[PDB]
Amino acid sequence: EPLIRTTISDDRGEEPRYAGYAASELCSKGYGIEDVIGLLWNKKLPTREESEIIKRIVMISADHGPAVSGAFGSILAACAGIDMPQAVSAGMTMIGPRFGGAVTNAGKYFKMAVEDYPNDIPGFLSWMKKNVGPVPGIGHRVKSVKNPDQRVKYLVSYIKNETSLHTPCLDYALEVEKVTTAKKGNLILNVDGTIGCILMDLDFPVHSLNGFFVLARTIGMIGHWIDQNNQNSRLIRLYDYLINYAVKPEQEVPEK
Amino acid sequence: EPLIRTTISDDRGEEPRYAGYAASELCSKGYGIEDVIGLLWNKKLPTREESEIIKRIVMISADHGPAVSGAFGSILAACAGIDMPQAVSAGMTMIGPRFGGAVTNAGKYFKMAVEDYPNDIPGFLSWMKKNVGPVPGIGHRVKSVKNPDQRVKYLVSYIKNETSLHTPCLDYALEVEKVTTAKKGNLILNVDGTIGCILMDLDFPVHSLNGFFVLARTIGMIGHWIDQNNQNSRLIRLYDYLINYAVKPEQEVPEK
Amino acid sequence: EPLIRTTISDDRGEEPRYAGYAASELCSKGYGIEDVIGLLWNKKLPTREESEIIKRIVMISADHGPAVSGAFGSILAACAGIDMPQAVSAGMTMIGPRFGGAVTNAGKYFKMAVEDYPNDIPGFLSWMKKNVGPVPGIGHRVKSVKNPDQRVKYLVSYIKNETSLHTPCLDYALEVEKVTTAKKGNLILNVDGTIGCILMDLDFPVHSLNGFFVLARTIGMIGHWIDQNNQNSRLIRLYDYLINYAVKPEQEVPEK
Amino acid sequence: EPLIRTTISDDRGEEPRYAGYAASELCSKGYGIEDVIGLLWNKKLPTREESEIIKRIVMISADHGPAVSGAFGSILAACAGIDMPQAVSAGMTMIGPRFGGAVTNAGKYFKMAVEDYPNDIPGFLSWMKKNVGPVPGIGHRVKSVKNPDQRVKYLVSYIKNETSLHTPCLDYALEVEKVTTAKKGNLILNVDGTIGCILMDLDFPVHSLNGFFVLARTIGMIGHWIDQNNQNSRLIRLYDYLINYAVKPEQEVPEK
């Protein structure tokens, strides 16, 4: 009775087979990292145009500076003298509802919009406000109509002008963006919404969606760990004035 | 007084700059994930031939089945119902001296061989036996002269026949392999030794070396998590006969 | 302006204050680890009976062998040569819906049972079957009416015969057990259900419930890491026959 | 044939046996968490004096505010919406050479001092300066002769006045402190040095020393996670002025 069942990778031969294809044969025939991602996560070789999109999603989301949770977690561990894989694992642990997770929720709700509200953006927005609250993939702290997110503008322009891919989730999100930005300038289609829609339009299943942010941000977290080690950075201690000690009154311990 | 100092990535503009280059501009000009890796880990755009090698190292090492520590850790967490980033972080935590770590040690000692024993393989082997023990990057449990590692054979053949790159560490390791395999057939140049030498020959610094295994194996760990979730796999419990309970004699608790 | 707000601990003096009490003063006056747990997790010094219960919950939950996810994760990392904190972090990552998490759900649903179905076990069981699935805290793979869980029998007997604590959630769960075990012998009140109910009955906040399993099992995971290191245990590799390779048929890679 | 060998815990009976003792029997006879720690980490029931020391080490070490790496890592994950076990695993990942790790080094080097430099503090200090660097367990950022660490003063006073335990490592460290504090007021025997020496003097195995900091700080990290969740704390973003962007000059991407 086997303990585990696996379907994606076979290491038993002279080299691993990813969804039935020999790793060196993928290399030899000119395939890339983006193609191995499609094979191991979706058991399907991407088409030429899908491959170009996967490559761009990873490149555009590789890093977003040291202030955000994943990179900061990796930096904190690097400065505490932790080895690279363990430091990057601490930063990766930050990926969830507030850091990267909106990719999945945006994919889910824009897919629902296409299926249940195809010719009804007001109905979709009304249902979202009532049942979810803010629309996942809409809104940014600083990026806006006046200050666009070039990561979004580039990905959208590339998929629309350099591919023939039909993108109904992304198309719907772009129509919603026109409405939400008319309400408030900061209500843009953000990079999580963009990637979430594109991945649904590339036929990736809902539970694979987070893989793209996890993998891409690992590139950046490894980079931040290397950077801190190159600088011989010292242990981080949060400055006292950055902490609000809203603690209980000091008390004497009562006798038992 | 800033809390942290960063040198690799600037998110303050319309899009991130990786070692001074705009992410969308790298995409537009036909660069890939392998190029973003070079920028974020080494602050240098790889040459055309270096880029082809980085791409192949990642593709060849993306996964090696579910039995090994990283993939198995990710599977265990997936079967316990843990979300993808946290499950992959558990598998990534396994990367160290026995799982992936030999890449760094092989790079270090073959670089030392080139510098200190250039025309003296017997001297290098004698020093290694006395001061280290088995040579890192030499030996495999099942792969041998009779059963070659096609991952090694492919990477070596590609860098030698499809690039003009000078590879002194790899060349030295290949010369050592001829000697060690003459001693015992299983003493091949393994994939860790191969990649470790190539990365030293691509001028990556010693402490960046582990990034390649960490990033590549994240592709596979994400895949294994998705696979277990697609199958709706049940909680793993190690079968009783697989555990040797070499426990102490059962004793009564003494009165205090 | 402050980055974080904290309410539980103040390190600024000659020693830390936990919910207002000096650590050495707690030691001096004969308080224990269980008292520090109550202070840091609930900002309240436990009463003597509450302290006795917290102590017992931790002792009973410290470990449950090497086959379960947390201990096994810690062992896998120990055998891969990973340092103790990082190895224990990998095992801790396994704590979730299938490993330990049922403590919180059992607490939540038995509290709901007391409030919404006080004299109606059939109504509670019907609602649970329809809206949740199997009742959290009910059932075990091997423990049963014939083979009782002495951890449960002890905790129940102690709280009923050695304390005056009012336990409505636990009382309800015990009444449910009388019904479910009459249906099938394995439908016992399990240790997660027992602890979850007791914690609810102790008025511990819903957010804190998982702390008890996390802390207690850390004792066992540290032990397993030490044990594997004392034995100089070798790298674990899952035996080939324990893996079902339900992989895709081998295919040639198509030309681009 | 078995995959793993275990010696500390047996779950196969009606309840787990820790180093041969039944968990409920330890509870019944008045033993505590500190006794379970001795059993699972050292396979020996502590004596009453050893038990009192273990209890105090854990209580004194439970937390040291939110500014330090472990607690801060747990807070960062809590504020990113990560579940408790995974958040605490991120904080635990910070435990290493700069955060908690000095306990082991101080134990190791003060044991060496007793064995190799018994009546020779200048010889020990000279060897340490030449071969190690700053003496592990000596020095503090803010605690000094003028501002003592009450955690140290309490533990030292308790073991000297309330036990008959022979403490040669601790005695040596205290003699070193008399010399180093005469050189500079901040060169005190710190809490890591104190605990490390005491653990060595208790004959705990070198492999186990880190267990005490890992376990104790898990109490605090769980507390910090609960605290942030009670407050419904927002996502942390490191303020721009706290980051020094020492980035490369912006450049155009060259054509391939």
XYZ file of N, CA, C and O in Angstrom, chain A residues 1-9 11 13-16 18 23-24 26-28 30-34 36-37 40-41 43 55-56 58-66 72 75 84-86 88-89 92-95 143 148-151 154 207-208 210-211 214-215 218-220 222-231 236-239, chain B residues 1-9 11 13-16 18 23-24 26-28 30-34 36-37 40-41 43 55-56 58-66 72 75 84-86 88-89 92-95 143 148-151 154 207-208 210-211 214-215 218-220 222-231 236-239:
648
model
N 0.837 -1.190 0.000
C 0.000 0.000 0.000
C 0.888 1.262 0.000
O 1.548 1.588 0.992
N 0.944 1.966 -1.139
C 1.782 3.178 -1.195
C 1.306 4.262 -0.225
O 0.101 4.396 0.029
N 2.262 5.015 0.326
C 2.004 6.115 1.248
C 1.533 7.353 0.468
O 0.698 8.108 0.965
N 2.091 7.582 -0.729
C 1.737 8.742 -1.558
C 1.490 8.362 -3.018
O 2.037 7.367 -3.507
N 0.692 9.179 -3.711
C 0.406 9.014 -5.137
C 0.809 10.321 -5.805
O 0.419 11.407 -5.349
N 1.606 10.209 -6.855
C 2.121 11.373 -7.565
C 1.789 11.258 -9.039
O 1.775 10.146 -9.562
N 1.518 12.396 -9.712
C 1.170 12.334 -11.149
C 1.987 13.254 -12.060
O 1.792 13.206 -13.279
N 2.821 14.141 -11.486
C 3.476 15.186 -12.290
C 4.913 14.945 -12.716
O 5.375 15.592 -13.663
N 5.672 14.139 -11.951
C 7.114 14.039 -12.174
C 7.641 12.629 -11.911
O 7.304 12.025 -10.893
N 11.198 10.622 -11.599
C 12.661 10.704 -11.448
C 13.389 9.369 -11.669
O 14.628 9.327 -11.590
N 14.064 7.393 -14.203
C 14.918 7.161 -15.372
C 16.274 7.848 -15.292
O 16.759 8.179 -14.200
N 16.914 8.055 -16.461
C 18.227 8.710 -16.551
C 18.131 10.197 -16.195
O 19.128 10.810 -15.829
N 16.920 10.755 -16.293
C 16.620 12.138 -15.910
C 15.108 12.257 -15.635
O 14.321 11.422 -16.111
N 14.678 13.319 -14.925
C 13.251 13.453 -14.643
C 12.390 13.714 -15.874
O 12.825 14.341 -16.845
N 8.800 15.506 -16.725
C 7.812 16.471 -16.205
C 6.566 16.335 -17.087
O 6.617 16.629 -18.296
N 13.325 16.358 -19.202
C 13.849 17.714 -18.915
C 14.864 18.185 -19.969
O 14.725 19.290 -20.493
N 15.859 17.342 -20.319
C 16.894 17.766 -21.280
C 16.332 17.956 -22.683
O 16.825 18.791 -23.425
N 13.299 19.138 -23.314
C 12.645 20.456 -23.277
C 13.714 21.527 -23.523
O 13.501 22.426 -24.349
N 14.881 21.395 -22.840
C 16.011 22.312 -23.027
C 16.484 22.312 -24.476
O 16.617 23.379 -25.070
N 16.748 21.117 -25.021
C 17.279 20.940 -26.371
C 16.401 21.587 -27.439
O 16.931 22.223 -28.349
N 14.452 24.137 -27.195
C 14.330 25.580 -26.999
C 13.253 26.069 -26.059
O 12.964 27.273 -26.050
N 12.686 25.168 -25.225
C 11.676 25.547 -24.229
C 12.353 26.246 -23.040
O 13.579 26.182 -22.908
N 11.564 26.939 -22.217
C 12.098 27.703 -21.096
C 11.547 27.331 -19.741
O 10.747 26.391 -19.593
N 11.939 28.129 -18.744
C 11.481 27.946 -17.360
C 9.932 28.019 -17.314
O 9.291 27.214 -16.625
N 9.348 28.992 -18.049
C 7.894 29.205 -18.131
C 7.172 27.942 -18.634
O 6.054 27.669 -18.203
N 8.377 24.732 -18.233
C 8.484 23.769 -17.133
C 7.420 24.107 -16.061
O 6.832 23.190 -15.493
N 7.160 25.411 -15.812
C 6.103 25.841 -14.877
C 4.727 25.268 -15.345
O 4.031 24.630 -14.559
N 4.724 21.328 -14.792
C 4.655 20.859 -13.412
C 3.418 21.327 -12.648
O 3.001 20.649 -11.714
N 2.821 22.451 -13.054
C 1.658 22.974 -12.331
C 0.333 22.663 -12.996
O -0.702 22.687 -12.325
N 0.261 20.230 -15.985
C 0.477 19.016 -16.784
C 0.199 19.236 -18.276
O -0.284 18.346 -18.974
N 6.010 33.945 -18.885
C 7.340 34.530 -18.725
C 7.213 35.965 -18.196
O 7.885 36.328 -17.229
N 6.351 36.775 -18.835
C 6.162 38.179 -18.445
C 5.542 38.327 -17.069
O 5.988 39.189 -16.310
N 5.918 36.318 -14.511
C 7.002 36.043 -13.536
C 7.999 37.219 -13.454
O 8.321 37.683 -12.352
N 8.454 37.715 -14.616
C 9.427 38.824 -14.666
C 8.883 40.092 -13.994
O 9.588 40.730 -13.200
N 7.617 40.436 -14.287
C 6.984 41.652 -13.741
C 6.747 41.568 -12.222
O 6.730 42.602 -11.553
N 6.547 40.375 -11.693
C 6.237 40.237 -10.276
C 7.402 39.694 -9.428
O 7.189 39.364 -8.261
N 8.629 39.595 -10.013
C 9.826 39.073 -9.314
C 10.147 39.787 -7.996
O 10.593 39.163 -7.033
N 9.919 41.101 -7.944
C 10.176 41.845 -6.713
C 9.437 43.174 -6.698
O 9.149 43.735 -7.762
N 9.137 43.682 -5.485
C 8.533 45.001 -5.388
C 9.115 45.773 -4.209
O 8.407 46.484 -3.499
N 10.431 45.685 -4.067
C 11.132 46.443 -3.043
C 11.199 45.747 -1.704
O 10.522 44.745 -1.464
N 11.950 46.336 -0.778
C 12.175 45.676 0.516
C 11.140 45.970 1.606
O 11.246 45.394 2.694
N 10.671 41.837 3.260
C 11.074 42.279 4.600
C 11.352 41.079 5.544
O 12.346 41.102 6.275
N 14.681 39.683 4.640
C 15.717 40.634 5.110
C 15.950 40.490 6.629
O 17.101 40.451 7.082
N 20.148 31.170 3.602
C 19.231 31.564 2.525
C 17.911 30.770 2.458
O 16.872 31.422 2.397
N 17.891 29.407 2.353
C 16.595 28.727 2.167
C 15.629 28.974 3.315
O 14.432 29.216 3.081
N 16.155 28.978 4.554
C 15.322 29.200 5.735
C 14.832 30.652 5.805
O 13.644 30.878 6.057
N 14.358 32.696 3.152
C 13.358 32.817 2.091
C 12.043 32.103 2.516
O 10.950 32.625 2.249
N 12.154 30.972 3.249
C 10.954 30.278 3.737
C 10.139 31.180 4.695
O 8.904 31.168 4.636
N 8.381 33.723 2.456
C 7.321 33.014 1.738
C 6.093 32.761 2.653
O 4.941 32.782 2.176
N 6.348 32.508 3.954
C 5.281 32.296 4.939
C 4.308 33.502 5.017
O 3.170 33.352 5.449
N 4.768 34.695 4.612
C 3.945 35.916 4.633
C 2.862 35.931 3.543
O 1.980 36.784 3.597
N 2.985 35.065 2.515
C 2.058 35.057 1.378
C 0.719 34.500 1.812
O 0.623 33.370 2.295
N -0.832 53.985 -6.436
C -1.038 53.940 -7.887
C -2.470 54.359 -8.203
O -3.376 54.109 -7.399
N -0.121 55.794 -12.982
C -0.413 54.385 -13.335
C 0.627 53.356 -12.923
O 1.811 53.672 -12.704
N 0.150 52.105 -12.794
C 1.025 50.990 -12.513
C 1.494 50.490 -13.870
O 0.718 49.828 -14.581
N 2.744 50.817 -14.240
C 3.320 50.397 -15.527
C 3.376 48.856 -15.657
O 3.295 48.344 -16.771
N 3.417 48.121 -14.533
C 3.381 46.642 -14.600
C 2.041 46.196 -15.238
O 2.036 45.315 -16.108
N 1.737 47.503 -18.998
C 2.530 46.677 -19.895
C 1.874 45.306 -20.161
O 1.761 44.902 -21.322
N -6.849 26.985 -7.674
C -5.881 26.633 -6.633
C -4.416 26.669 -7.109
O -3.514 26.631 -6.272
N -4.166 26.741 -8.448
C -2.791 26.892 -8.935
C -2.393 28.386 -8.958
O -1.199 28.700 -9.069
N -2.033 30.945 -6.946
C -1.012 31.471 -6.044
C 0.432 31.068 -6.384
O 1.359 31.730 -5.920
N 0.613 30.013 -7.181
C 1.955 29.573 -7.563
C 2.790 30.656 -8.223
O 4.002 30.744 -7.997
N 4.077 33.111 -5.521
C 5.042 32.372 -4.696
C 6.393 32.205 -5.442
O 7.449 32.574 -4.905
N 6.345 31.713 -6.700
C 7.560 31.498 -7.462
C 8.276 32.824 -7.803
O 9.483 32.957 -7.557
N 9.925 34.531 -4.863
C 11.094 33.778 -4.388
C 12.350 34.354 -5.077
O 13.418 34.418 -4.449
N 12.229 34.770 -6.361
C 13.392 35.362 -7.068
C 13.871 36.596 -6.283
O 15.049 36.703 -5.935
N 12.931 37.483 -5.960
C 13.235 38.695 -5.208
C 13.730 38.431 -3.791
O 14.709 39.053 -3.355
N 15.291 35.740 -2.598
C 16.661 35.231 -2.709
C 17.608 36.446 -2.925
O 18.644 36.537 -2.273
N 17.232 37.343 -3.840
C 18.016 38.544 -4.113
C 18.249 39.389 -2.873
O 19.383 39.814 -2.604
N 17.172 39.637 -2.095
C 17.302 40.441 -0.866
C 18.206 39.766 0.155
O 19.021 40.454 0.792
N 18.100 38.427 0.283
C 18.983 37.693 1.209
C 20.457 37.890 0.781
O 21.311 38.232 1.616
N 20.753 37.698 -0.519
C 22.116 37.872 -1.057
C 22.627 39.296 -0.783
O 23.778 39.474 -0.359
N 21.765 40.293 -1.042
C 22.079 41.717 -0.882
C 22.487 42.035 0.562
O 23.548 42.648 0.800
N 21.667 41.585 1.529
C 21.968 41.829 2.941
C 23.298 41.149 3.361
O 24.091 41.732 4.110
N 23.546 39.939 2.841
C 24.784 39.203 3.115
C 26.013 39.876 2.477
O 27.063 39.949 3.119
N 25.869 40.419 1.247
C 26.941 41.167 0.580
C 27.336 42.390 1.401
O 28.512 42.736 1.468
N 26.332 43.069 1.987
C 26.554 44.271 2.801
C 27.034 43.969 4.223
O 27.365 44.902 4.960
N 18.658 43.407 12.862
C 17.654 44.476 12.902
C 16.994 44.487 14.270
O 16.585 43.437 14.769
N 16.866 45.685 14.854
C 16.097 45.893 16.071
C 15.156 47.071 15.797
O 15.626 48.147 15.423
N 13.834 46.855 15.951
C 12.871 47.935 15.706
C 13.088 49.041 16.728
O 13.128 48.761 17.926
N 13.343 50.282 16.252
C 13.586 51.432 17.133
C 12.427 51.609 18.106
O 11.266 51.415 17.729
N 17.539 57.966 10.604
C 18.389 56.788 10.514
C 17.583 55.608 9.934
O 16.691 55.053 10.583
N 17.867 55.237 8.677
C 17.123 54.117 8.072
C 17.357 52.795 8.808
O 18.451 52.553 9.336
N 16.316 51.960 8.854
C 16.354 50.643 9.482
C 17.067 49.642 8.558
O 17.763 48.752 9.044
N 16.866 49.764 7.239
C 17.477 48.856 6.259
C 18.098 49.604 5.078
O 17.668 50.714 4.744
N 19.085 48.973 4.437
C 19.743 49.502 3.241
C 19.588 48.438 2.164
O 19.879 47.256 2.401
N 19.103 48.857 1.007
C 18.846 47.947 -0.102
C 19.563 48.440 -1.342
O 19.677 49.651 -1.524
N 20.050 47.514 -2.195
C 20.775 47.946 -3.412
C 20.273 47.335 -4.722
O 20.791 47.701 -5.783
N 19.349 46.359 -4.657
C 18.977 45.593 -5.859
C 17.703 45.995 -6.580
O 17.542 45.644 -7.754
N 16.735 46.595 -5.864
C 15.405 46.805 -6.437
C 14.774 48.112 -5.960
O 14.796 48.409 -4.765
N 11.193 50.096 -6.104
C 9.748 50.032 -6.386
C 9.058 51.404 -6.431
O 7.844 51.471 -6.685
N 9.025 54.010 -8.427
C 8.514 54.580 -9.678
C 7.215 53.948 -10.159
O 6.464 53.356 -9.370
N 6.927 54.087 -11.468
C 5.713 53.530 -12.085
C 5.766 52.000 -12.129
O 4.730 51.349 -12.227
N 6.977 51.443 -12.038
C 7.214 49.997 -11.973
C 8.597 49.752 -11.338
O 9.452 50.654 -11.340
N 8.857 48.523 -10.849
C 10.157 48.264 -10.235
C 11.330 48.310 -11.208
O 11.201 47.983 -12.392
N 15.082 46.676 -11.495
C 15.926 45.570 -11.003
C 17.359 45.890 -11.442
O 17.652 45.933 -12.652
N 11.440 46.692 -15.247
C 10.910 45.329 -15.487
C 10.240 45.196 -16.865
O 10.558 44.268 -17.607
N 9.346 46.140 -17.233
C 8.630 46.029 -18.517
C 9.560 46.199 -19.711
O 9.320 45.614 -20.755
N 12.692 45.116 -19.784
C 13.362 43.813 -19.924
C 12.441 42.888 -20.729
O 12.906 42.235 -21.677
N 11.128 42.876 -20.382
C 10.127 42.087 -21.109
C 10.069 42.493 -22.576
O 10.143 41.630 -23.448
N 9.918 43.799 -22.832
C 9.769 44.351 -24.177
C 10.929 43.981 -25.097
O 10.693 43.633 -26.254
N 12.833 41.387 -25.023
C 12.952 39.941 -25.196
C 13.749 39.177 -24.164
O 14.070 38.005 -24.400
N 14.033 39.799 -22.998
C 14.746 39.129 -21.903
C 13.798 38.164 -21.177
O 12.580 38.237 -21.373
N 14.358 37.247 -20.386
C 13.567 36.231 -19.701
C 13.713 36.205 -18.198
O 14.406 37.040 -17.593
N 13.095 35.185 -17.599
C 13.151 34.973 -16.145
C 14.629 34.831 -15.700
O 15.028 35.397 -14.673
N 15.429 34.069 -16.480
C 16.857 33.831 -16.217
C 17.640 35.153 -16.146
O 18.587 35.259 -15.370
N 16.250 38.182 -15.244
C 15.810 38.819 -13.999
C 16.554 38.166 -12.809
O 16.930 38.874 -11.878
N 16.786 36.834 -12.858
C 17.563 36.129 -11.820
C 18.992 36.754 -11.724
O 19.422 37.131 -10.636
N 18.693 40.398 -10.156
C 18.365 40.477 -8.737
C 19.364 39.776 -7.819
O 19.485 40.163 -6.660
N 20.092 38.779 -8.332
C 21.032 38.039 -7.487
C 22.476 38.465 -7.656
O 23.289 38.224 -6.761
N 23.268 41.605 -9.747
C 23.232 42.997 -10.219
C 23.915 43.174 -11.581
O 24.536 44.200 -11.855
N 19.054 29.398 -17.670
C 17.754 28.842 -18.041
C 17.786 27.314 -17.902
O 16.890 26.732 -17.289
N 18.819 26.673 -18.474
C 18.948 25.210 -18.439
C 19.174 24.675 -17.037
O 18.571 23.659 -16.689
N 18.039 25.938 -14.238
C 16.720 25.983 -13.559
C 15.785 24.867 -14.070
O 15.192 24.137 -13.264
N 15.683 24.718 -15.401
C 14.803 23.700 -16.010
C 15.191 22.279 -15.581
O 14.321 21.479 -15.211
N 16.502 21.979 -15.598
C 17.006 20.638 -15.247
C 16.817 20.303 -13.756
O 16.690 19.127 -13.411
N 16.820 21.302 -12.893
C 16.726 21.043 -11.462
C 15.353 21.383 -10.851
O 15.228 21.380 -9.626
N 14.330 21.681 -11.699
C 12.969 22.042 -11.241
C 12.328 21.014 -10.302
O 11.613 21.374 -9.367
N 12.583 19.726 -10.543
C 12.028 18.690 -9.675
C 12.785 17.378 -9.816
O 13.373 17.112 -10.871
N 12.762 16.553 -8.750
C 13.366 15.235 -8.849
C 12.514 14.197 -8.125
O 13.028 13.296 -7.466
N 11.207 14.295 -8.329
C 10.283 13.317 -7.777
C 9.826 13.631 -6.372
O 10.373 14.505 -5.697
N 8.874 12.845 -5.878
C 8.280 13.142 -4.567
C 8.988 12.528 -3.357
O 8.568 12.794 -2.226
N 8.831 16.045 -0.594
C 8.095 15.276 0.416
C 7.525 16.188 1.534
O 6.370 16.009 1.933
N 4.518 17.901 0.164
C 3.430 16.900 0.061
C 2.786 16.640 1.440
O 1.554 16.599 1.555
N -0.778 26.582 -0.005
C 0.412 26.457 -0.856
C 1.669 27.188 -0.345
O 2.710 26.538 -0.292
N 1.666 28.528 -0.071
C 2.936 29.183 0.293
C 3.562 28.602 1.550
O 4.785 28.386 1.596
N 2.717 28.285 2.551
C 3.204 27.724 3.810
C 3.712 26.289 3.619
O 4.794 25.959 4.116
N 4.969 25.014 0.750
C 6.224 25.143 0.009
C 7.345 25.667 0.952
O 8.489 25.195 0.864
N 6.996 26.564 1.903
C 7.990 27.056 2.866
C 8.546 25.900 3.733
O 9.749 25.880 4.018
N 10.944 23.984 1.462
C 12.132 24.819 1.277
C 13.053 24.771 2.526
O 14.291 24.834 2.394
N 12.443 24.676 3.726
C 13.192 24.575 4.984
C 14.152 23.356 4.998
O 15.123 23.341 5.749
N 13.865 22.334 4.179
C 14.698 21.122 4.096
C 16.037 21.358 3.381
O 16.901 20.489 3.443
N 16.166 22.472 2.630
C 17.366 22.749 1.834
C 18.514 23.118 2.749
O 18.432 24.072 3.525
N 22.995 6.511 -9.668
C 23.588 6.935 -10.941
C 25.067 6.562 -10.954
O 25.709 6.552 -9.897
N 24.167 6.550 -16.396
C 24.490 7.990 -16.265
C 23.340 8.910 -15.892
O 22.153 8.591 -16.098
N 23.715 10.061 -15.307
C 22.755 11.093 -14.988
C 22.655 11.956 -16.235
O 23.570 12.754 -16.504
N 21.567 11.787 -17.006
C 21.349 12.558 -18.240
C 21.271 14.079 -17.962
O 21.634 14.867 -18.833
N 20.898 14.487 -16.738
C 20.895 15.927 -16.394
C 22.339 16.477 -16.499
O 22.549 17.557 -17.065
N 23.707 16.214 -20.240
C 23.159 17.280 -21.064
C 23.809 18.646 -20.764
O 24.220 19.341 -21.698
N 28.092 32.606 -1.938
C 26.864 32.703 -1.146
C 25.587 32.851 -1.995
O 24.490 32.698 -1.457
N 25.715 33.150 -3.319
C 24.532 33.187 -4.185
C 24.212 31.770 -4.716
O 23.107 31.544 -5.228
N 23.415 28.782 -3.640
C 22.207 28.073 -3.225
C 20.896 28.607 -3.826
O 19.904 27.880 -3.827
N 20.899 29.842 -4.330
C 19.696 30.420 -4.930
C 19.115 29.586 -6.058
O 17.892 29.486 -6.203
N 17.234 26.547 -4.571
C 16.054 27.074 -3.874
C 14.951 27.486 -4.887
O 13.804 27.027 -4.777
N 15.322 28.295 -5.904
C 14.354 28.753 -6.882
C 13.809 27.594 -7.747
O 12.587 27.446 -7.885
N 11.487 25.226 -5.938
C 10.205 25.869 -5.617
C 9.207 25.546 -6.750
O 8.012 25.356 -6.478
N 9.690 25.485 -8.015
C 8.788 25.148 -9.144
C 8.159 23.769 -8.880
O 6.936 23.617 -8.908
N 9.009 22.792 -8.563
C 8.557 21.436 -8.275
C 7.685 21.329 -7.030
O 6.649 20.650 -7.062
N 5.756 23.659 -5.633
C 4.450 24.232 -5.974
C 3.645 23.155 -6.757
O 2.474 22.932 -6.462
N 4.290 22.522 -7.739
C 3.657 21.470 -8.528
C 3.127 20.333 -7.672
O 1.979 19.895 -7.847
N 3.959 19.845 -6.726
C 3.529 18.746 -5.841
C 2.356 19.157 -4.963
O 1.424 18.355 -4.781
N 2.372 20.407 -4.458
C 1.243 20.899 -3.646
C -0.050 20.880 -4.496
O -1.086 20.360 -4.049
N 0.013 21.425 -5.727
C -1.144 21.453 -6.642
C -1.656 20.029 -6.910
O -2.871 19.787 -6.880
N -0.719 19.105 -7.182
C -1.010 17.704 -7.502
C -1.784 17.026 -6.363
O -2.846 16.413 -6.597
N -1.277 17.169 -5.125
C -1.942 16.568 -3.968
C -3.361 17.160 -3.761
O -4.306 16.428 -3.441
N -3.503 18.474 -3.985
C -4.797 19.156 -3.873
C -5.778 18.725 -4.978
O -6.960 18.523 -4.691
N -5.284 18.527 -6.220
C -6.104 18.026 -7.329
C -6.660 16.644 -7.006
O -7.797 16.338 -7.358
N -5.830 15.795 -6.372
C -6.220 14.428 -6.003
C -7.080 14.356 -4.739
O -7.565 13.273 -4.399
N -1.407 12.265 5.679
C -0.413 11.187 5.703
C -0.150 10.785 7.145
O 0.067 11.645 7.999
N -0.141 9.470 7.398
C 0.274 8.914 8.677
C 1.298 7.818 8.365
O 0.989 6.900 7.602
N 2.519 7.934 8.926
C 3.552 6.924 8.672
C 3.107 5.593 9.261
O 2.731 5.544 10.433
N 3.039 4.537 8.420
C 2.608 3.203 8.859
C 3.463 2.728 10.027
O 4.676 2.971 10.047
